[PDB]
Amino acid sequence: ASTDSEKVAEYLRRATLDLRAARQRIRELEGEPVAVVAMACRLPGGVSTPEEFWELLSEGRDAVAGLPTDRGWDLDSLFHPDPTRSGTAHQRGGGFLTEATAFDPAFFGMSPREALAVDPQQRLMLELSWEVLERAGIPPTSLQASPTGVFVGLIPQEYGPRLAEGGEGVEGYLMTGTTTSVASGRIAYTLGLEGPAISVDTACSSSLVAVHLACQSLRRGESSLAMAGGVTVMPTPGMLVDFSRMNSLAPDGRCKAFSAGANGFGMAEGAGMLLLERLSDARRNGHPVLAVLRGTAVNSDGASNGLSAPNGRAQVRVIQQALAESGLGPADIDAVEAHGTGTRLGDPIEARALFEAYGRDREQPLHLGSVKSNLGHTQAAAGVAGVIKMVLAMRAGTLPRTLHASERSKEIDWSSGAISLLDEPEPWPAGARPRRAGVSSFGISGTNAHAIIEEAPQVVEGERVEAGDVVAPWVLSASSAEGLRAQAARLAAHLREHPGQDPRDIAYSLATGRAALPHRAAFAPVDESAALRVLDGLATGNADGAAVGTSRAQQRAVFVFPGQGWQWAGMAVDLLDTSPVFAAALRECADALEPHLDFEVIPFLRAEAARVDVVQPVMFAVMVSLASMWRAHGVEPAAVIGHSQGEIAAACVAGALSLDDAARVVALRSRVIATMPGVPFFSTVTGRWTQPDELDAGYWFADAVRALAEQGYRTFLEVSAHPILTAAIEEIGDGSGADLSAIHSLRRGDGSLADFGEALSRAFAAGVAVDWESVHLGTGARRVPLPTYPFQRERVWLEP
């Protein structure tokens, strides 16, 4: 059968499937686009966050004021009005950072001496990395022993005294403090990553080159996350006074790109960092996507008329190569972020190259701009700044303005009109055609780089709306008291600025996200007004209505099963019906207990809200249900010292007898005790560490807690509607060793879930690990941007 009809069809189908899979793999290996998750920046002026950068760009403002008077510069003989005297600069102004002199060595594991030895560049890079990691939404403490690449772009320069002469207290740390490799080695060591760490020095085009490398390791597959950035800062006026010898610096210090009055390029300083991930991986895990990088190209200009002389053919070739790698055409680009350094000779060459590379096949004019007009030349910090500007403009749907462009140059020809200089803001709305942009960077060494950036896919739309009645806790942590106070003040301020936010979104973002730190605060407000009230109360200093407490290197909790003493319970049908964990575990144990003890689950767990024969089995049942829900809520137990019925409860929890079997044995105990009236576990009646198997039929306060504390467990948690013997334990807390805290579960008739919210808030208040995804799970809460960590900086300088 199947003669020549079915036999070959199956093989043909299999071969076609294999060919399709192989070609798909080829395409993925060659041209997989990458996605930008988050960005971080530090620019001259008051700019410290990308929002301020976009606000400055939209309002059209420059950030050039003068020179710094903090870094011990002479400032005086720096310009004898004769240009050619030794030690005479030419720039009477510029754009410089005002925060480089300050640092916070306490937050990191850094000693004041070696902190004084640390270069400002890596000093800024550490903060940039931490801020971008928090902005992405990934807890910075989760990235441990994982493949994550770091790529940095710097220029060595100099900071302090020479190594030969040494210092008085800081001698051994001089070498590591000033070295380009340590700039990324320190980041890798602090964050505990394991991917490649690379520092690249390729002049003003360094930063872009870095991201190019970050776009390759991700594509090949040697790393699953990349952090690429650049930095430039000046602790010495040497660069200006040496560049003035070439007479290439404009006096005032501005960039008049494509203007009739070009005089120089000026200098500045800054820092930028981006986080990159494969698009499929990022979308699989739900990480945010801001823009997509598709193709990059790096080239050299070859032999020219000197090292500083630029080339046009190389730029054209690199642009065409980037376009070919991206697999697009010259007509798919709407705007370009040209270099626009503002020099006399560079501008015509770059303009001609861009013309010949883009505008020959163009129906619509191409917009051109340069960020160096607003901020000046930032050396290696540039390149990434252009990328940030382009992505911000594309997201906001507006093209910003370029300054000092009202007087177009006279050495270039614009007869074709294919390139229109950006002098006024231009709307950039969404449409059928996706938006794309290109960024160029050229270095004085002779290396050129080009990149193409595209908008994120418009698939986020389609979110639904769901409501609920469960209130969720709010938590916030920091490493110092003032840090906690400032964080609370900033959160209250931001919540004041932006109204309409649901409590669920803020609760979820302040959930998994910010890391776990010594100083913690937690609460649970009904609405936002009382939330602001308690937040301002925390900001003032007196913590009332919330929970606080330091906890250094504490990660364990202890479950203790108290005996009788929580009587009258306060029947909670809401616990049984609202919580499904009860409605499963307690239901199972109850129907296990039903056949033996004639009493049903209907009669008194129906409750008349308005006898050891009955209570003890039901207290055991509700105890095991509560223990199950607690352990499912992320908090695991430890050795249990449960007394009386607590012995059977601990037997059930630690694995001595099964739920049905433990229920049956407690029913037998109740039936034999209703006549006379009228996993590591810690033994109670003997006081020893025992295995969970010896507990049998034959088996049926001070020294115990001393030994448990001496072991290393310093907290006690009892599952009871009313905490009993708490003071007895509490009095012991100061009596020996470290202090002891006991957390209640319920209150006097307060069976509402809000009581459990307070219990959880008190649990997190003192060194207890809680699985927040488990307690949130399904609520529809989505990520929401929040302010980053506020620091406490101090002056750290070392004069030469």
């Epitope: 199947s2 079915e6 036999k7 093989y11």
Partner: antibody
Amino acid sequence: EVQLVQSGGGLVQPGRSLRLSCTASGFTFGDYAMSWVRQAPGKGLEWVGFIRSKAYGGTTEYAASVKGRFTISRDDSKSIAYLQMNSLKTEDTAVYYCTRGGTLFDYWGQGTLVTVSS
Amino acid sequence: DVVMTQSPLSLPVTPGEPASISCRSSQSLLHSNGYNYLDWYLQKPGQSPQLLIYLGSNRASGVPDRFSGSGSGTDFTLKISRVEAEDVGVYYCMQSLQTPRLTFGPGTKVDIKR
């Protein structure tokens, strides 16, 4: 993907019927004539029977032994394959796999248990 | 009739150095069109069967490489260049000249050399 996910099974006394369902998904079920194979505990895999595609007629073939008590259904609407039992015996206790091809045995299912005893 | 295919029974292996299994036949399996109607199957311990090589020498997608089939229409062979610890189980030769294939045959066995 191209999951199959079989269903059915259990324990039945000798002389009884049962239904086994194979649920094709993740691919076009139009012309992918499938088959049923049986693996006894302690021995190798022995073929039971395949059902052709409707393009070539939709006929079926069986290999002796189980010829008179085994029938195959080809519900195209839900892309479901059915194996129907008839008067089972004790020696038929085996794990049943639902394949994808008729000559080239492609992606396999997960198997059932079905034991006959008393 | 049939070609009564057979294999060299059990073969213990060790991690590292390669291994191979031959497969003989009585009637040539080279079809007139110019192809060999042979394939190989692998059954893992306590798991569903799997397909490795079809039509003489062709690796199906998803196979973790390291497997190579070869041979003329009478003396086929399947060789593994690198031997790991998880590629242990039962291996079956299979033909396609006769459509009413009743059984997969005995099949060879592999284990850890000791």
